[PDB]
């Protein structure tokens, strides 16, 4: 049919619940058991890709502007070890010349990896990926919680994401100063423009290893 390429069964955490995603040309459509959305790739503002710190799951995020209750992002689960292989309903010459070489008509590999190549040449944007940060446990992200629920903080190499309820990304560039607040200990951002994010109840030996990242990243500690 008109569809590039069919994903069944996603999982997704915003909203929550499996959904298919049929990719076209120029949208997606977001299909699950009652609801319905169509995403036009011009929508697509970043895309990331996140190692869950249990060490067996991947999200893939995507940042949408407008947003689809609201979600500013669509988020996406995988476990690690799914696999899938695909044929485009193309040409080669076709997939060629629509995606810059990015894509081919058979394809296969990790499940996560596959979805987020596809966009990523879908949507003309780089994928987003964490970059030298660890945590006490040796993870990428740190156990906290924001606005009373449990997630995981991300400092990445340009900014913070916290997933999953609700997400939240923060730019390195939007923040005036950070505060390590008492209660575990409260990681305190303040933006540019007079707000605040507040990632609470992190297990104190995360501390020093957070402190050390944004002295690293030249933020501003006003502590």
Same mark, same amino acid.
């Given at each position: 049919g008109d569809a590039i390429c069919i994903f069944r069964e996603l999982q997704c955490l915003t909203p929550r619940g499996r959904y298919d995603i049929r990719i076209y040309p120029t949208f997606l459509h977001l299909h699950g058991k009652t609801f319905d959305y169509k995403i036009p790739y011009t929508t697509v503002l970043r895309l990331f890709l996140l190692p869950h710190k249990d060490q067996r799951q991947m999200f893939f995020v995507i940042s949408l502007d407008?947003?689809? @209750?609201?979600?500013?992002?669509?988020?996406? *689960? $995988?476990?690690?070890? =799914?696999?899938?292989?695909?044929? *485009?309903?193309?040409?080669?010459?076709? #997939?060629?010349?629509?995606?810059?070489? &990015?894509?081919?008509?058979?394809?296969?590999?990790?499940?996560?990896?596959? #979805?987020?190549?596809?966009?990523?040449?879908?949507?003309? &944007?780089?994928?987003? #990926?964490?970059?030298? $940060? !660890?945590?006490? /446990?040796?993870? !990428?992200?740190?156990?906290c919680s924001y606005k009373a629920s449990s997630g995981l903080l991300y400092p990445l190499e340009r900014g913070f994401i916290y997933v999953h309820k609700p997400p939240v990304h923060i730019r390195?560039? =939007?923040? /005036?100063?950070?505060?390590?607040? &008492?209660?575990?200990?409260?990681?305190?951002? =303040?933006?540019? !423009?007079?707000? !605040?994010? @507040?990632?609470? /109840? %992190?297990?104190? =030996?995360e501390y020093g290893?957070?402190?050390?990242? #944004?002295?690293?990243?030249?933020?501003? %500690?006003?502590?």
């Open positions: 407008p947003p689809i @209750t609201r979600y500013h992002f669509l988020i996406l *689960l $995988f476990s690690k070890d =799914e696999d899938i292989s695909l044929t *485009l309903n193309m040409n080669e010459e076709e #997939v060629e010349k629509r995606f810059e070489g &990015r894509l081919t008509k058979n394809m296969s590999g990790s499940l996560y990896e596959m #979805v987020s190549r596809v966009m990523k040449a879908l949507v003309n &944007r780089k994928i987003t #990926v964490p970059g030298n $940060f !660890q945590g006490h /446990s040796g993870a !990428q992200c740190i156990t390195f560039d =939007e923040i /005036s100063f950070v505060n390590f607040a &008492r209660g575990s200990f409260d990681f305190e951002i =303040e933006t540019k !423009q007079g707000t !605040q994010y @507040t990632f609470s /109840s %992190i297990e104190r =030996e290893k957070l402190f050390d990242f #944004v002295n690293a990243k030249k933020l501003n %500690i006003k502590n």
